[PDB]
Amino acid sequence: KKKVIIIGAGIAGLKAASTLHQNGIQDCLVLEARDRVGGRLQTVTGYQGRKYDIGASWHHDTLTNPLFLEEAQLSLNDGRTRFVFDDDNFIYIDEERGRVDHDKELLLEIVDNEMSKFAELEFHSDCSFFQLVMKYLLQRRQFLTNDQIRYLPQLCRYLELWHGLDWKLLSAKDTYFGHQGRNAFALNYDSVVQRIAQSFPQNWLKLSCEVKSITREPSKNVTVNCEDGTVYNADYVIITVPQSVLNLSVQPEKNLRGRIEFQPPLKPVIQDAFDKIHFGALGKVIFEFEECCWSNESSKIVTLANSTNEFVEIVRNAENLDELDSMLERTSVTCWSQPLFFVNLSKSTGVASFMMLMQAPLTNHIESIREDKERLFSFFQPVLNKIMKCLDSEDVIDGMRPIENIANANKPVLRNIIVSNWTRDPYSRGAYSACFPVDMVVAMSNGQDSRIRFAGEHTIMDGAGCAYGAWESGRREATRISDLLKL
Amino acid sequence: PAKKKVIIIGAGIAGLKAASTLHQNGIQDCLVLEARDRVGGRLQTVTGYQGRKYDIGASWHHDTLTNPLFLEEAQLSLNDGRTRFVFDDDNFIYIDEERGRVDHDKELLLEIVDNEMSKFAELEFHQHLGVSDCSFFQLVMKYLLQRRQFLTNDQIRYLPQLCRYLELWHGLDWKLLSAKDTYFGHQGRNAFALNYDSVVQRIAQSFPQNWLKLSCEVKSITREPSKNVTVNCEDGTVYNADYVIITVPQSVLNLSVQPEKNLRGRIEFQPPLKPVIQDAFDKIHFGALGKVIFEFEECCWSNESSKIVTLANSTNEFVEIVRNAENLDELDSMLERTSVTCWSQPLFFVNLSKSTGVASFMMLMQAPLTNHIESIREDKERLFSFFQPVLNKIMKCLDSEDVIDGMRPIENIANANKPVLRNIIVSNWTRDPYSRGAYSACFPVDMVVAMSNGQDSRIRFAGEHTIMDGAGCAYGAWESGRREATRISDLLKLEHHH
Ligand SMILES: Cc1cc2nc3c(=O)[nH]c(=O)nc-3n(C[C@H](O)[C@H](O)[C@H](O)COP(=O)(O)OP(=O)(O)OC[C@H]3O[C@@H](n4cnc5c(N)ncnc54)[C@H](O)[C@@H]3O)c2cc1C
Ligand SMILES: Cc1cc2nc3c(=O)[nH]c(=O)nc-3n(C[C@H](O)[C@H](O)[C@H](O)COP(=O)(O)OP(=O)(O)OC[C@H]3O[C@@H](n4cnc5c(N)ncnc54)[C@H](O)[C@@H]3O)c2cc1C
Incomplete structure (x- = not known):
């Protein structure tokens, strides 16, 4: 059916979806387990309507952060306050x-x-x-x-x-x-999420779709199964669930909410990486x-x-x-x-x-x-x-x-x-990649194979653990898959 | 024609540490020719209103986490409780x-x-x-x-x-x-040195006194094809040495590449300083x-x-x-x-x-x-x-x-x-x-290399401008002294049985 299936609607998955569309690509999807987009970026509302990012709240490395620079230009153009x-x-x-x-x-x-x-x-x-x-x-x-x-x-x-x-x-x-x-303190990371999410066919988004398993067939076709029975088949698949989630892909049973059963299982270099991060x-x-x-x-x-x-x-x-x-x-x-x-x-x-x-x-x-x-x-x-x-x-x-x-x-x-x-x-099981007293980047950067690819704050080195890192990693996998298919 | 193992021109922290190392290594018949009426060079402690002392030159031990000179001074203080810095x-x-x-x-x-x-x-x-x-x-x-x-x-x-x-x-x-x-x-x-002079004296004092020759301004250094080096103080005297360690400031050594022999501090080299050295002056x-x-x-x-x-x-x-x-x-x-x-x-x-x-x-x-x-x-x-x-x-x-x-x-x-x-x-x-400035600086490695490789096996160089780690600093100068003194110590060791 679909060209590419994006799993997760955090900023990684959203950016990726954004790219594909921007690359004219069509027939894609964004499957998100939660009933909202944003992943670890969520702005909540409290007393007298005050808003707070209960998730990410700063743009780090403003001298080179590309996500931040993009936001700055938008602000130079319209004068709206996006940060301080x-x-x-x-x-x-x-x-x-x-x-x-x-x-x-x-x-x-x-x-x-x-x-x-x-x-x-x-x-x-x-x-x-x-x-x-x-x-x-x-x-x-x-x-x-x-x-x-x-x-x-x-x-x-x-x-x-x-x-x-x-x-x-x-x-x-x-x-x-x-x-x-x-x-720079983001004065509405939800504005960053919203923009990206509204830059591609809104009909690609499928909320409350927990993905139970991903299978690799012979005929260059990948089959994705949200646990509600509905099944999808696409060319390429960009996985963006948190490292903590993904890690479940190699444990006893297969229940545990969020865990994705891979077929075939994830290569040894991948499974090894979870031991060093x-x-x-x-x-x-x-x-x-x-x-x-x-x-x-x-x-x-x-x-x-x-x-x-x-x-x-x-x-x-x-x-x-x-x-x-x-x-x-x-x-x-x-x-x-x-x-x-x-x-x-x-x-x-x-x-x-x-x-x-x-x-x-x-x-x-x-x-x-x-x-x-x-x-x-x-x-x-x-x-x-x-x-x-x-x-x-x-x-x-x-x-x-x-x-x-x-x-x-x-x-x-x-x-x-x-x-x-x-x-x-x-769907988060923790905040973000962290080091205990490296290789996962390379593992994710390559992919399970030419079509089972990854993305997320843990799949890149510049901006590791950060929103912009995840943002960029989403473009990486995106641009790629784009160049090909386009043909 | 006084014979000597090693002649060190300049008694700043580089030459003083050089001679020191030498003595500590059992080398005798050495000389430290210094132009001023004092030792210390860019390390000088003056006196003012009511006996207050100040370092008008270097004042701080930089990079204390690694500075060997500093670490050496701290060790002393750990042993006698004497405050040498702050x-x-x-x-x-x-x-x-x-x-x-x-x-x-x-x-x-x-x-x-x-x-x-x-x-x-x-x-x-x-x-x-x-x-x-x-x-x-x-x-x-x-x-x-x-x-x-x-x-x-x-x-x-x-x-x-x-x-x-x-x-x-x-x-x-x-x-x-x-x-x-x-x-x-x-x-x-x-670490603010509470009198850098104390560091200067402690090192000076670590080798033969009669080794020191103040108020002698070296004016020329000649390499005899006969495997010896000739040095002449302005006060007419002439010395002969196996090795020489020049520690004059980069600013003074620079005067050597220009024509005009009667400049205070200038040393006339024969043969003249190799091209790699001359040209390095265009780069710092x-x-x-x-x-x-x-x-x-x-x-x-x-x-x-x-x-x-x-x-x-x-x-x-x-x-x-x-x-x-x-x-x-x-x-x-x-x-x-x-x-x-x-x-x-x-x-x-x-x-x-x-x-x-x-x-x-x-x-x-x-x-x-x-x-x-x-x-x-x-x-x-x-x-x-x-x-x-x-x-x-x-x-x-x-x-x-x-x-x-x-x-x-x-x-x-x-x-x-x-x-x-x-x-x-x-x-x-x-x-x-004898200083002509404060220390080496960049206007918007060539020098450190030419200096460290010497004019030739016998004519060597030391000082704050002849080394990477601690370039421009007292400890770098100090280190370069140890460097040159060691190389010679070793060569003089393999000296056909003594
Ligand atoms: C408290 C906190 C504060 C932070 N502060 C900052 C900050 O100031 N600056 C900064 O740069 N970063 C900060 N971060 C990190 C930032 O939030 C992350 O780098 C970034 O949001 C990660 O994005 P992502 O797109 O890779 O994943 P998003 O969580 O981050 O997750 C990927 C998506 O996968 C979905 N998913 C998971 N499992 C399944 C499944 N089985 N089926 C379908 N969908 C699934 C999830 O629901 C989610 O939406 C903070 C994080 C936390 C937790
Ligand atoms: C104002 C000032 C402040 C400084 N502050 C610091 C500081 O806080 N920390 C730090 O680490 N460094 C500092 N420095 C740098 C430090 O003083 C030098 O790196 C170091 O003293 C250089 O030592 P040297 O032994 O190579 O040479 P010394 O000048 O530095 O010179 C070598 C000796 O050669 C003698 N000489 C010259 N020509 C002849 C000749 N023709 N014949 C015989 N003898 C000759 C000189 O009189 C001198 O005694 C400062 C320097 C200045 C000027």
């Missing part, structure tokens, strides 16, 4: 100390820089980012004060919100990575306040996990990486058990809200209780008040239920909380 | 004449666009096709052009001036500086980093930071030209439009009060300013008058009052919150015939 450069000077908050950023005596950003060059030098075996930070501290303690030894490691973990992985689950070798310039769990929590009543100094605030001086003496005393490694091994998870990244939306978008980013293992636990508004307010209440105090304000009032308080005005009134759910959603 | 990096304070402090600003966010700029440059040359180099200025104008849609007006105005602190890394005005060589990734924090130059010390009575200002950069003047008109230019071509035409002031270029001040407790400012300057300011380094009244505006402005931003000129003490006991300037020291590297 929200990079800012980070505010770091510790529970006891308070602010420790731009400190006259702590000079933490400066040692962090050094720490980073140290990381580049170490490589230029591989351990965990946590293990790398310990070596650094050990090897440079002679030139680090006691307060730097205490806090630096906590501040430097802000990188956890970059991969969505705690410093002990994260590969040190992939941790530090330069960026091609500032970041994991997936992160970046999550988000939106805190909607009645109105801003705090200082809008910065739009970037990070709260540090708690630290101790007992940790220092062990740095001072340890003789080597083993004495320290063994001395360190010497519960209760709260809002102060890990670093939390808060985007203060008031300064950058004028919205009285906080977009907080979180990592594994915390993400999954918070998303598990996403419907428990009071439990959620109780869990983050401490860091929220600590933030408000540092930003010259008061403790948060809970106004999530009818009948505010009448005596607010000077106190931040929380009106709502929104939480992501990517780790519990079967 | 990590003085800090959050930079940027002062505009108009806008006052513009650092860490919630709206300007200068350091942030500066970072993106560094990245733009990296992305501009890392992908090395037939690149085509240009001045650093040209590089910045290109950045502003390509990214104007993502920069506010004030960023376009103040970024190009704030990014010029780099002029103080090379000692060159951004119009004279190679863009391709502008950005350098430092291997970690810097010398910068003019200079210093000025503003000594104060006592500290009556904020010690938030020890790093203060004063930006040069900018104009909203510049913003308009960038906003209206169609390409680099037109931007230059448009940019094409008096006299030099303390605001005509960025200046870098090290507020020592915080970092060392000494109520003084160590200010760095670049070419061409350095030349002009060193040319009048005696007219103190003119110096003060020249640096009064920025000096006052700094003090204002640091919660203090204008400067009072007390360089000629006339009793002042009623100005506790008023800063009193008592002295002004100025470097003199451009006019000193």
